[PDB]
Amino acid sequence: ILDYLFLLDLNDDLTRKAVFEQVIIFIFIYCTMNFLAWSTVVELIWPTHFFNRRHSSSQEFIRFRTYTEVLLKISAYNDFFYVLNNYYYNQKLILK
Amino acid sequence: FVMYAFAAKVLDHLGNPFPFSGHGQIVAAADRWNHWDVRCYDNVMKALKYIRIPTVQNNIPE
Amino acid sequence: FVMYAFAAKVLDHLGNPFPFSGHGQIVAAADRWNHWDVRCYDNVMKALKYIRIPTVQNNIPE
Amino acid sequence: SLHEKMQTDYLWVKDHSQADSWAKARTHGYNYIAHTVPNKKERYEMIWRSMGKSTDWELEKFRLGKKFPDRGNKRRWFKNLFRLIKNPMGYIFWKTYKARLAKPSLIVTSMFIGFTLGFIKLKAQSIAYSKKQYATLRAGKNIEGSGQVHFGYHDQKWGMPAIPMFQLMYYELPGNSIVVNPCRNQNYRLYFEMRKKLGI
Amino acid sequence: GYKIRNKSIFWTRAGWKNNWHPKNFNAPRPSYGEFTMGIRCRNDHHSFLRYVQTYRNMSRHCKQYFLGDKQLEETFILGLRSLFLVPYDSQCLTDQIKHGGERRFVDQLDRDFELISYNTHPYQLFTYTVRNEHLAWKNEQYEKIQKGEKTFEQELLDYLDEQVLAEKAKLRDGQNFSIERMTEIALHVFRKARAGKVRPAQDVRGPDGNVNDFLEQRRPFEHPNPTGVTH
Numbered sequence: 001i002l003d004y005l006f007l008l009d010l011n012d013d014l015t016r017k018a019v020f021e022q023v024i025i026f027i028f029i030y031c032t033m034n035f036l037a038w039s040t041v042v043e044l045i046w047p048t049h050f051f052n053r054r055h056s057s058s059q060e061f062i063r064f065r066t067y068t069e070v071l072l073k074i075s076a077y078n079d080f081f082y083v084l085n086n087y088y089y090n091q092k093l094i095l096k
Numbered sequence: 097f098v099m100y101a102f103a104a105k106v107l108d109h110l111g112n113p114f115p116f117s118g119h120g121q122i123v124a125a126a127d128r129w130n131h132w133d134v135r136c137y138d139n140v141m142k143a144l145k146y147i148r149i150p151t152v153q154n155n156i157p158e
Numbered sequence: 159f160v161m162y163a164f165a166a167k168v169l170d171h172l173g174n175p176f177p178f179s180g181h182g183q184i185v186a187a188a189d190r191w192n193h194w195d196v197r198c199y200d201n202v203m204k205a206l207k208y209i210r211i212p213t214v215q216n217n218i219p220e
Numbered sequence: 221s222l223h224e225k226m227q228t229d230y231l232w233v234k235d236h237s238q239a240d241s242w243a244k245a246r247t248h249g250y251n252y253i254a255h256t257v258p259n260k261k262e263r264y265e266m267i268w269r270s271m272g273k274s275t276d277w278e279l280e281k282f283r284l285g286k287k288f289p290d291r292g293n294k295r296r297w298f299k300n301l302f303r304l305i306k307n308p309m310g311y312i313f314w315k316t317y318k319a320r321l322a323k324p325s326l327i328v329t330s331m332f333i334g335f336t337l338g339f340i341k342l343k344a345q346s347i348a349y350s351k352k353q354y355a356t357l358r359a360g361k362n363i364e365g366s367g368q369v370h371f372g373y374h375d376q377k378w379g380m381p382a383i384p385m386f387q388l389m390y391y392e393l394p395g396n397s398i399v400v401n402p403c404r405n406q407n408y409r410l411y412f413e414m415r416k417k418l419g420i
Numbered sequence: 421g422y423k424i425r426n427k428s429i430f431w432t433r434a435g436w437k438n439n440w441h442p443k444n445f446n447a448p449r450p451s452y453g454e455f456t457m458g459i460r461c462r463n464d465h466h467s468f469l470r471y472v473q474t475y476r477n478m479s480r481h482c483k484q485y486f487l488g489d490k491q492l493e494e495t496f497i498l499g500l501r502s503l504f505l506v507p508y509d510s511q512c513l514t515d516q517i518k519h520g521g522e523r524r525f526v527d528q529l530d531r532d533f534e535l536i537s538y539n540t541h542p543y544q545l546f547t548y549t550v551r552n553e554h555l556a557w558k559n560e561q562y563e564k565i566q567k568g569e570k571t572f573e574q575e576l577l578d579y580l581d582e583q584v585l586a587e588k589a590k591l592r593d594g595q596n597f598s599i600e601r602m603t604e605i606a607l608h609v610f611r612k613a614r615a616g617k618v619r620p621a622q623d624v625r626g627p628d629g630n631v632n633d634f635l636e637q638r639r640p641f642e643h644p645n646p647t648g649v650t651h
């Protein structure tokens with residue numbers, strides 16, 4: 001009911017400023033430009049991460065286990081890993 | 097083949113398959129409400145109705 | 159460099175270096191024998207001398 | 221896997237022709253020959269070897285036998301057209317992958333896009349000028365020739381040079397800015413006075 | 421294999437392999453009390469206790485969704501410690517970091533716990549997926565053992581036990597059954613078993629140089645039109 005709702009009018013905007021119809025064009029363009037730029041910056045951290053986690057280790061340093069490698073080793077081993085461990089344990093620790 | 101037959105049905109009305117090239121063609125019924133909201137404008141009536149005949153002095157009417 | 163300098167001397171008269179493009183430009187002396195063998199033709203005189211002024215009825219003179 | 225055969229068939233199209241099922245019609249490679257590759261002469265030797273093994277190196281049998289075209293290349297232009305319509309961006313992406321491995325600079329890419337979009341912009345204005353000439357024709361002025369590059373004694377307007385100097389001084393006429401005068405809204409005063417007179 | 425040939429690969433303007441204090445123009449400089457009027461600094465001595473509280477928060481808030489799985493809690497602890505032990509073992513001199521390494525890591529871990537408190541951290545979602553896939557396989561084995569059936573893992577273990585007896589019964593000249601020989605016996609059985617399963621193609625190229633995909637169908641053309649469904 002208040003006069004603040006008059007701002008929703010675009011039929012007669014040419015009677016006050018007629019500026020809204022041109023500024024939102026820039027805002028849509030500015031959003032598109034930042035979409036292309038920011039998506040490039042954030043997404044392109046993967047080639048560095050994919051390379052470092054696979055080539056940055058050296059034999060004169062200790063490679064320490066990360067969180068994901070702790071969970072995968074303990075809670076995501078396959079059947080062959082389970083067999084090979086017990087196969088080594090039964091033959092050498094039990095049966096000698 | 098099916099989409100080619102369906103495009104044939106549409107292209108009878110659309111005409112030109114390329115974009116930004118032409119307009120579709122639809123024959124509509126003639127009633128009293130044709131152009132009802134532009135009857136006030138004179139230049140719209142002249143552009144729609146009148147095909148003027150060029151004279152020897154080839155100019156737009158003064 | 160020498161042929162380029164010599165071509166500069168010629169192009170002051172020839173003008174356009176490409177073939178089938180234009181004509182050379184030579185300023186000649188005005189004497190009584192200019193166009194002496196085509197003085198009989200009337201259309202040659204009108205093409206050379208007269209720059210007609212187009213009117214509102216834009217047509218060649220009848 | 222379980223859903224592999226169903227999904228692979230749903231994703232891509234296979235060849236339905238059995239052109240190579242017929243033995244003698246199979247080509248030796250002499251129908252579509254590569255002419256400029258550096259191993260060109262090795263291709264011809266393999267074609268010759270294929271022709272010699274088919275006749276046990278008695279090529280008179282090939283001369284008397286019938287020669288066939290490459291039936292496997294039939295309707296290949298139509299099949300590529302249908303893939304281009306089915307997935308135009310996927311067809312363009314994979315057909316240009318090897319070419320897009322070499323990426324030009326940001327400047328060259330910007331020049332390609334700028335001149336291409338600038339050319340389309342001039343084409344759009346050229347189309348709009350043709351509608352102006354049609355309105356001029358209907359208004360009673362017959363038109364000899366066409367275009368706006370006046371040969372005679374008239375002023376021309378070439379169109380905005382697509383460089384920042386002219387793009388800062390000039391801008392095209394926005395049709396949406398030509399409006400009805402707002403004094404039209406003052407006619408509504410007649411309605412408010414009539415409603416009060418009629419006791420509405 | 422292949423080694424980096426550039427000898428100056430790890431050279432920076434601040435030294436060899438320096439990723440703790442890179443060289444820049446605005447370098448840190450000391451402040452003198454007698455000459456300093458006022459100062460605006462955000463450094464403090466609160467990172468130590470914030471480091472302790474952050475570990476307790478991350479541990480306790482993640483254990484909310486473990487459903488009392490004791491093995492998962494102990495596994496998560498080992499993983500959580502590996503995240504907090506980064507500055508203590510890294511090659512980077514975390515004590516020589518530009519503007520305080522302790523503050524930097526504490527603020528970095530607080531961003532992790534904020535995601536953990538909402539149960540949206542990717543390490544959490546990865547843990548639930550890995551644990552569900554693990555328990556589904558353990559439940560499959562339990563149902564086969566209750567039914568008196570032998571699990572696939574026991575069949576290989578029993579098959580591998582009789583292979584060692586057969587090899588050590590024929591190898592009488594030498595009596596040193598090394599772990600190398602024990603390994604290649606199992607791997608020979610593992611390859612044969614892996615090749616027996618109907619697995620999706622993992623390697624790019626099969627026995628030939630050609631790829632093992634569904635797209636690797638070239639001429640000759642010998643397939644007819646696709647047939648429809650049967651009634």
Ligand SMILES: CCCCCCCCCCCCCCCCCC(=O)OC[C@H](COP(=O)([O-])OCC(O)COP(=O)([O-])OC[C@@H](COC(=O)CCCCCCCCCCCCCCCCC)OC(=O)CCCCCCCCCCCCCCCCC)OC(=O)CCCCCCCCCCCCCCCCC
Nearest residue numbers: 113114290291292293294295296297298299300301304305
């Ligand atoms: C008495 C009353 C009745 C009177 C009847 C009178 C008429 C007689 C009827 C019969 C006439 C023909 C006689 C029998 C011929 C049989 C020959 C044969 O064995 O098959 C050869 C031929 C072999 O083809 P193929 O080996 O399988 O593959 C072709 C190659 O592999 C190549 O494949 P490709 O992938 O490489 O593509 C290239 C291809 C075609 O590629 C193209 O580029 C052509 C593009 C055409 C389509 C685009 C047109 C552009 C306008 C539309 C735009 C499309 C936009 C789509 C995209 C949207 C926008 C992005 O090149 C060709 O042109 C191939 C055409 C056949 C070769 C003939 C020599 C061609 C040179 C002449 C070229 C000019 C004509 C082209 C017409 C093309 C029609 C297919 O097959 C046929 O020609 C089939 C035709 C038989 C159809 C019978 C239909 C029923 C007949 C009755 C119809 C009634 C009509 C009534 C008319 C009324 C009067 C107006």
Ligand SMILES: CCCCCCCCCCCCCCCCCC(=O)OC[C@H](COP(=O)([O-])OCC(O)COP(=O)([O-])OC[C@@H](COC(=O)CCCCCCCCCCCCCCCCC)OC(=O)CCCCCCCCCCCCCCCCC)OC(=O)CCCCCCCCCCCCCCCCC
Nearest residue numbers: 099100102103106110113114115302304305306307308312
């Ligand atoms: C050479 C330089 C000059 C080139 C000039 C350009 C040529 C014309 C291009 C005009 C572009 C208009 C774009 C239309 C909208 C497309 C938007 C889209 O997302 O497309 C995806 C869309 C696929 O998505 P989908 O909807 O899921 O369809 C797949 C379904 O599985 C469908 O089921 P299905 O797979 O089982 O069906 C078989 C499949 C394969 O079968 C075929 O493709 C053969 C059928 C050919 C029929 C003849 C087509 C003639 C043109 C279409 C009809 C005229 C225009 C109709 C209205 C189009 C505008 C919506 O058919 C299809 O792929 C879809 C059917 C195609 C449309 C058929 C029906 C037409 C009427 C549509 C009615 C709805 C709108 C009402 C009218 C609105 C008017 C206001 O593709 C299309 O539908 C057609 C795209 C055609 C545009 C590509 C043309 C070639 C590329 C242009 C040149 C590029 C140069 C740039 C190079 C840059 C290098 C860096």
Ligand SMILES: CCCCCCCCCCCCCCCCCC(=O)OC[C@H](COP(=O)([O-])OCC(O)COP(=O)([O-])OC[C@@H](COC(=O)CCCCCCCCCCCCCCCCC)OC(=O)CCCCCCCCCCCCCCCCC)OC(=O)CCCCCCCCCCCCCCCCC
Nearest residue numbers: 309312319320322323324325328329331332333335336339
């Ligand atoms: C065209 C010949 C005459 C026609 C007769 C037909 C001849 C038959 C052949 C025709 C068939 C092929 C056509 C040519 C294709 C190009 C050849 C090729 O494939 O080579 C591989 C070629 C790889 O190049 P490369 O030599 O191996 O290595 C380049 C290195 O990166 C770095 O190399 P760099 O460091 O040494 O130098 C950098 C730069 C070299 O610097 C440049 O190339 C300068 C380019 C500056 C801009 C030029 C704009 C062209 C004017 C277009 C404006 C409209 C035309 C009308 C208005 C102007 C009138 C003149 O590299 C290049 O760009 C290499 C391309 C150079 C030759 C091609 C240039 C063609 C320009 C047109 C000439 C005039 C045509 C007039 C139009 C006639 C119409 C009647 O593929 C490319 O990537 C370059 C092509 C351009 C790609 C630029 C990025 C475009 C991205 C667009 C994204 C937006 C698209 C959105 C999707 C659309 C909707 C779905």
Ligand SMILES: CCCCCCCCCCCCCCCCCC(=O)OC[C@H](COP(=O)([O-])OCC(O)COP(=O)([O-])OC[C@@H](COC(=O)CCCCCCCCCCCCCCCCC)OC(=O)CCCCCCCCCCCCCCCCC)OC(=O)CCCCCCCCCCCCCCCCC
Nearest residue numbers: 032033034036037038040041324325326327329330384388
């Ligand atoms: C704390 C340090 C500072 C802060 C650091 C933080 C910076 C963050 C960097 C993050 C990078 C952005 C990440 C997203 C971009 C990815 C997409 C991309 O565009 O990469 C291009 C990508 C990389 O290009 P590149 O071949 O590797 O060359 C890279 C560099 O150019 C290098 O190659 P180059 O060495 O051979 O280049 C030589 C250079 C040599 O240049 C020079 O030696 C001197 C240059 C002086 C410029 C003179 C200015 C004159 C001004 C006159 C103005 C008059 C008119 C003004 C009218 C206004 C109203 C009055 O000349 C150039 O060619 C420069 C390239 C064009 C530069 C355009 C911007 C210039 C100003 C940059 C503002 C930033 C200032 C930072 C402060 C730095 C202070 C040290 O190539 C592509 O084109 C593929 C993408 C397709 C793009 C086509 C469409 C582009 C539009 C969309 C782009 C994305 C949205 C917009 C983002 C910003 C783009 C302008």
